[PDB]
Design a protein around this ligand. Structure first.
Ligand SMILES: CC1=C(/C=C/C(C)=C/C=C/C(C)=C/C=C/C=C(C)/C=C/C=C(C)/C=C/C2=C(C)C(=O)CCC2(C)C)C(C)(C)CCC1
Length: 324
């Protein structure tokens, strides 16, 4: 009584989340000292900071970054050093709580602008000067082996999980942290995805590529879910649309091959792969992704998982029975 999908059985399609070195890297990072973490972030960012899109965030998000960074700027070098520690360790402090309330791209923008100020000498370069442990230097080496997309996904996971959240069920973020980006490249040309004819996943890509989230969210079942890489599923159309507006806007998605299986009741499981650009890096970083779709018999998306991949070989279709 495989059908219909539940969230669990949907999560399990095509052997579940694509295998990755990222979880072990994040777990190892989280066991380091706070100084080792900040120092490693300085070096990790020194690889990738050149290719970051300058001036990416919109006005309202930039105002939040700049207000908080102002409060930081007029602290002493010692207090500034301590504030980076408080945020990075998710300490209960006013500034760490303020950071905790930021949507994800506002958090990334905060550190971007801080890193610029650290270069103007407007803020203490304490991360630059931290003495890394062997464990930290070993982890650095491991990270440098990841592909470009994997490296920025590690940075992102680390940055967005910083700050203190005082509430177990916080409010949705302000409507001004929505639609943060303005596109630079033309919308991706009408997709041919070798192996995928089903109109649902093709409409999904078409809508997301032109920021048409009203279309995209209406492709979901009422109780449908969207699972971002190494994140919990976002469930129902209200939550999914809010998330799409906050975090899935301005992406260029180039799925190019995939496969389907039809279940006896007409449900369908699909796994599509290809390359995606984030407005944070533009054409500079092509992330290798897989989308795993579970469709109900009416063609609605019950579930879509987005898995971060690491290699060209992971783009190919998986091989039953184990889906390797
Ligand atoms: C901290 C720190 C520092 C500064 C760090 C800085 C400055 C880091 C900046 C990092 C940035 C900017 C990273 C951005 C990463 C963005 C990524 C990896 C985006 C991936 C997006 C994906 C994969 C989306 C795919 C999706 C698809 C395809 C769907 O179909 C549905 C939606 C969605 C799931 C969204 C300094 C140096 C001061 C030292 C002290 C500590």
């Amino acid at each position: 009584p495989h059908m219909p999908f539940t969230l669990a059985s949907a999560q399990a399609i095509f052997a579940g989340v694509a295998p990755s070195r990222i979880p072990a890297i994040l777990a190892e990072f989280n066991r380091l000292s706070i100084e080792d973490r900040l120092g490693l972030l300085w070096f990790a960012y020194t690889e990738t900071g050149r290719s970051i899109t300058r001036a990416a965030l919109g006005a309202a998000s930039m105002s939040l970054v700049e207000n908080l960074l102002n409060e930081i700027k007029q602290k002493s070098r010692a207090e500034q050093t301590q504030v980076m520690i408080d945020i990075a360790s998710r300490a209960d402090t006013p500034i760490s709580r303020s950071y905790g309330y930021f949507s994800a791209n506002t958090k990334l923008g905060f550190w971007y602008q801080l890193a610029e100020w650290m270069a103007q000498g407007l803020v203490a370069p304490a991360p630059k000067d931290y003495q890394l442990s062997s464990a930290a230097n070993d982890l650095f080496n491991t990270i440098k082996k990841l592909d470009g997309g994997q490296q920025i996904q590690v940075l992102r996971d680390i940055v967005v999980n910083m700050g203190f959240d005082a509430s177990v069920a916080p409010a949705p973020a302000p409507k001004a942290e929505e639609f943060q980006f303005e596109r630079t490249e033309p919308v991706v040309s009408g997709l041919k995805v070798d192996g995928i004819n089903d109109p649902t996943p093709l409409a999904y890509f078409e809508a997301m590529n032109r920021d048409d989230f009203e279309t995209a969210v209406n492709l979901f079942a009422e109780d449908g879910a969207l699972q971002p890489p190494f994140q919990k599923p976002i469930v129902g159309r209200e939550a999914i649309l809010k998330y799409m507006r906050e975090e899935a806007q301005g992406l260029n998605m180039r799925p190019a091959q995939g496969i389907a299986e039809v279940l006896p009741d007409g449900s369908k499981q699909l796994r599509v792969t290809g390359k995606v650009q984030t407005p944070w890096f533009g054409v500079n970083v092509a992330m290798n992704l897989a989308w795993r779709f579970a469709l109900n018999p009416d063609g609605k998306i019950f579930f879509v998982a987005i898995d971060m991949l690491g290699s060209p070989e992971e783009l190919l279709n998986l091989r039953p029975p184990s889906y390797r």
